[PDB]
């Protein structure tokens, strides 16, 4: 298992750009000949985010062809800034068992030695997150028939408060309901989130809980300042691979960059 | 508690850049100089690295200067780069608590919610890393002594392979015997590492476990590819907060890059 | 009083790039989320500019939208580039006391501890500057009526030659009639102006005369090279603020740079 | 009369970068050789600045090569980061008319038609100014038997408060007396200065007062903020003509940049 | 003769971008400003190149009006991703001695001293190139009636494998044809190409044979990987002159960079 | 045979940066770092350049050690930037077969298809070039004794005039001796030079000749303007190789740029 997981996207129309000056389409077609361009090849991609910036139709189109014309299996997940309908409505097709009924967005891959669960954390008409009672009990249904085998979730919204000033007001608002499953399944040992557009990282018992920096544009973090912040530093994503017993992510950048070279004992210390 | 937790400094002399080319110590002095610029301020430093890159005293003198210049206390470990006896005749005064004696340098931490334990994984004449016997138990002792209190290790070398193919087998050669103690210990839950120049994370039980990026140069994950590769990528570190019951890392950018603008809802979107 | 001073936006239609290379429009919706982004925040923000660089419908759209976006009262004053019907067209709006007529746009602000005065030195179907006789006499009345009250003036076209060999042909051509204004009024200290797309100053008598750089793209100045040059050196903007008893002017910088950091007198002089 | 005139060059020592980051000596000659590479020729180069950072005399040394490597007269005076004694040693052979007595550095041009004067505004123990007894009455008696050819003064430490809350408390502290001689005096029709690294200008009767950028890092304006910033912000410098009866200052960057290209018409408005 | 020679340009449709995120239209509409604001002009302007990237209309009319703002007259040729009919309908304005048949474009100019021969390499339905009989005879005819007069022709495609294993396969197939010519005529001294984006040179008894990089996205030379890459490395142009006796080819950057700065003895080698 | 070849290195002493701004040493050294980490690994290096900038001991200390740390055989030949004993004293252990009398270094390979002449062109107290009797003998024996094998050139002078006003005064004064061997001899093929900091060429007969681009700054070429220009433009070097019976000569970036990604044809042109 390999897997390249980005997120939070939030392409924009064509030729548009984010705020109107981050150009959010060219960017994320860098990633995605990026990442198909990559020398050791991703089993599939999973994009946990913000597909589209404000959930328009244009904004899907975009969206469709761009994500498209990566060359992998794709596994798509809404965010607050998605619209349900119109993401299942143009999305789907790339990911085709997220379903028929744009409420009940969700799917388990029973493909490899850790099994992945992708689910809908978005709610409409709000930032914050929340996990509905049908995603819960299709969580325990998962979670039970599944056993010891390992599992990971792939959801939007972090389900704890991480102290973020920013973004722990629109976290995931009942996310002690997940919480709550991880005390319960000691099998579900990883969840990845997108939101943040930042890699920050935790444990809750069993479960190691990381939200992912965003493919454009990251947001900082800090713990009392309110101010909604938004910089240009570099993006990056998180590779996941199965080694052994264990599942290892690492960050991957998508920054151009110098090198690389290759290490020599001499030029490292001359005599 | 705020920590700031960089890495694999890998200081050079006074003339000299590292491979000819590389500026760490330019590099390095900016770090520096960014960390205790921040807003929010972190309580201590932590730097797990090779401090420097030789083992030489001319850039342990170096070294002291550039760490010294932090307005933090201090923590420092040694890596496989890093000499026993210079580390200490150099860089002791500048982390007290480390100890008198070259070939057991360690201390615990007490002032915060989690316990914070240093050690030294180097051992002398090779790159791979080992837990002395009197580590090993002086850990042990910490955790037995310690009850229901969390506990974080700061080591320089990861304790089990993350499927590296450069950096696996020179990682922590008798790593399961850490290991042994996060199976026995519940409330051993952090171990952070450097080592891999590279932000890669796993969970082994309730241990979150994870390697830091450098502050300069980074090596790239490769699975196939022994090709002993370094880049410039981007650098980062870690920040690591204490939020209420739950300990979280978050990744603090140490590129110079555009931003930060403030979110508007209506630039977002535009009718 | 604190005033953020740009010009010479120059924007252009909808997915064009000035000279099809220069994106303008992204340029400038960045210096807006630059600019309300700022955290000591203007009262107003001028723009002294060709605000379009054809004087086309679809150019005043994008300027509408963009500068519309800014969280500030706008003061806006035609250039060369604009045209003068459809400039308040479009624009009037977002500054309502332009007028009503497009062959008089200028107005007088009495708010702060320095009385402002904006007017239009834009001529239809040239590039050089041309002062109304219908202007000259506003601008006495408004002097005189005003008092011992200090004045500054926006304007697009210096009033004098500048011994650019570049600008000066299409400086404003009668320029002696505002000069000599400063002559009868000693109350009349500040004049700023765009068009050069540099910060050049001067002074006569008591005014403080001055061209601003552009948000985008900045023309050099040469002494006896007669080449319509230009390039993309950093932009820039004035700030204006009220300080006691002076009217001060700073360069604020637009391009994205590294810093800041703090300064420490061991790191700057160490031993 | 063509002036280029810099400021703040902060050089360190031979091996040394200022704050162990920032390649002020690197900087500082390219911007030499930028210098005397210009078409246009400046007729002599002034220097108000803090020539070394922290007045050693290996400092001087390297200041006196690269300094020493301008292709033009230069005008040298000294700043709080100077040391008189060894400014004098030093650079007086680069500047012979600074005299000879380390305590009154001071001269005036006559060569063009504008009388030019440069004094020392440094004081011993101090980052704030001070004009000595003696200064203000070289000053007086140069204005007084000089008659109406005008007169600029160019100085280190601005001689009125500017708003700028980390510059303000170390300007030139009896600045007042300089203030009185441009009421008494209407001749002296520019003040220049240095300290500030910033382009901050103002008027006080017929005086242009205005600081310069530093050739390498800069400092913000913050009216609120006392935190002890500088950034790396684009350098520039201020060139200065004669325009027959008109001084005129404008800015010549000194980044490097993308550009120039020549404006064409069609290319900007095409059909 | 000064001729400014660039090639495949790879144009897409109005707000296209290649491959989503390479500006080509931008980088193009630089490069068009670049080479109408040389200091030395040169008589004409060459495109070898794949002008178009897809052969759709609309990427023509982009094409069009960019390579219209020229100031030069131009010689155009088609490339394996042109397409013979568009190509003459829009393009053929712009270089009239193309002729009137889409399938025997090609000219010979006579204004020099070496004289030019411009040649349809392409053939629909492959990226491989074909030299028609036609091409070939007309070649003959041409190389005849010119005597001793030296001789260059331009086409898109190498006569030649290279080496190259991404490019060589897609080659001039039947290149052997012009080879031949080579050895009948000592006149014809040069072959310039395109479609390797890349500075790749060889000689053929008297012919010199090059391949040119491209204006924007160039292809790296690998001898045996397979994988089609291509990079963002700097873009470039070639010259040709006429130097008495002598065609000498100059590379010419496209690229932004730092300088000109002048050569000085003393700062060359400091004492 | 592959064969990459650099030149004009022009080191400084450990200290040292050229003209004081630009960081020969470590540009070199990322070069050199560079070479050894290619893919594809050529079978030696030729240094054809000015090794030196000043001609000191304390320059070739560096030069030794830097191109020392290639893993490559070297052919390393001097410029007239090159002291000919100490380039012999400090270098002639890294490329044995130069000899043992500086005044006649030289020498010729035969390992390849093609034979390898070195040559030494610099003439002491000139910049201009000079083929001492003995070298041109030594030339036409070497082609005399060789037959039919075919033979390239490396000297750091251009043997002819190329139209460059700054470089031509300054070539190889009796150059047209070696032209001379051309026309005798024809299985001269290449020549290969450094002195002008760029990749001009020519064809002289057989003959191609060609200088190289600079490791790090370069010289454009001007044909009317004789000021001494240098700049920082993209460095590059040229790699031989030996293609059945073409020697092809192919541009290889120093430079650190975005990607390589991979072509996609349908990525190329979306439906
Ligand atoms: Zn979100
Ligand atoms: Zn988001
Ligand atoms: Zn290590
Ligand atoms: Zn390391
Ligand atoms: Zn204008
Ligand atoms: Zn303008
Ligand atoms: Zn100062
Ligand atoms: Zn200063
Ligand atoms: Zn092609
Ligand atoms: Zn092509
Ligand atoms: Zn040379
Ligand atoms: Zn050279």
């Not at 991609?45 to 975009?62: A, F, K, L, M, T």
């Not at 794709?74 to 409505?89: M, R, T, V």
Request: net charge negative.
């Amino acid at each position: 298992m390999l897997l390249a997981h980005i997120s939070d996207t939030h392409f924009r129309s064509r030729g548009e750009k984010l705020y109107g000056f981050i150009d959010v389409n060219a960017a994320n077609a860098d990633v995605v000949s990026q990442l198909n361009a990559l020398r050791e090849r991703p089993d599939a991609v999973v994009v946990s985010g913000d597909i589209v910036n404000c959930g328009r139709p244009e904004e899907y189109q975009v969206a469709r062809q761009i994500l498209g014309s990566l060359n992998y299996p794709l596994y798509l997940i809404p965010g607050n800034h998605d619209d349900k309908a119109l993401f299942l409505e143009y999305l789907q097709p790339l990911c085709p068992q997220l379903g028929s009924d744009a409420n009940n967005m969700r799917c388990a891959v029973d493909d490899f030695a850790t099994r992945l669960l992708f689910i809908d954390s978005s709610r409409a008409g709000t930032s914050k997150g929340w996990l509905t009672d049908e995603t819960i009990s299709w969580l325990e249904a998962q979670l039970f028939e599944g056993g010891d085998k390992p599992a990971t979730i792939f959801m939007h919204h972090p389900p704890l408060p991480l102290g973020n000033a920013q973004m722990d007001p629109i976290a995931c608002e009942n996310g002690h309901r997940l919480l709550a499953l991880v005390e319960r399944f000691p099998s579900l040992t990883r969840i990845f989130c997108g939101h943040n557009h930042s890699l920050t990282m935790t444990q809750y018992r069993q479960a190691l809980i990381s939200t992912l920096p965003g493919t454009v544009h990251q947001v900082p973090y800090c713990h009392e300042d309110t101010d909604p912040y938004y910089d240009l530093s570099p993006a990056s994503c998180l590779m996941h691979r199965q080694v052994g017993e264990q599942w290892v992510s690492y960050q991957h950048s998508l920054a151009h960059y110098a090198g690389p070279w290759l290490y020599d004992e001499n030029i490292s210390c001359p005599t």
